[PDB]
UniProtKB/Swiss-Prot annotation:
<keyword id="KW-0528">Neurotoxin</keyword>
<keyword id="KW-0964">Secreted</keyword>
<dbReference type="InterPro" id="IPR036574">
    <property type="entry name" value="Scorpion_toxin-like_sf"/>
</dbReference>
<keyword id="KW-0027">Amidation</keyword>
<comment type="similarity">
    <text>Belongs to the short scorpion toxin superfamily. Potassium channel inhibitor family. Alpha-KTx 05 subfamily.</text>
</comment>
<dbReference type="GO" id="GO:0005576">
    <property type="term" value="C:extracellular region"/>
</dbReference>
<dbReference type="InterPro" id="IPR001947">
    <property type="entry name" value="Scorpion_toxinS_K_inh"/>
</dbReference>
<feature type="modified residue" description="Tyrosine amide">
    <location>
        <position position="31"/>
    </location>
</feature>
<protein>
    <recommendedName>
        <fullName>Potassium channel toxin alpha-KTx 5.4</fullName>
    </recommendedName>
</protein>
<keyword id="KW-0800">Toxin</keyword>
<dbReference type="Pfam" id="PF00451">
    <property type="entry name" value="Toxin_2"/>
</dbReference>
<keyword id="KW-1015">Disulfide bond</keyword>
<feature type="disulfide bond">
    <location>
        <begin position="12"/>
        <end position="28"/>
    </location>
</feature>
<dbReference type="GO" id="GO:0015459">
    <property type="term" value="F:potassium channel regulator activity"/>
</dbReference>
<comment type="function">
    <text>Blocks small conductance calcium-activated potassium channels. Shows activity on KCa2.2/KCNN2 (IC(50)=0.0243 nM), KCa2.3/KCNN3 (IC(50)=1.7 nM), and KCa2.1/KCNN1 (IC(50)=42 nM). Induces cell death when tested on human T lymphoblastic leukemia Jurkat E6.1 and human breast cancer MDA-MB-231 cell lines which constituvely express KCa2.2/KCNN2, but not on human peripheral blood lymphocytes (which do not express KCa2.2/KCNN2).</text>
</comment>
<keyword id="KW-0632">Potassium channel impairing toxin</keyword>
<feature type="disulfide bond">
    <location>
        <begin position="8"/>
        <end position="26"/>
    </location>
</feature>
Amino acid sequence: AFCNLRRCELSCRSLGLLGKCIGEECKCVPA
């Protein structure tokens, strides 16, 4: 629906950590 979660998870991996959806947005979180 409103979150391209794998694109988010790989963007977070590229910085150094896991990704999650919030809603119409996604964010990164610790391992």
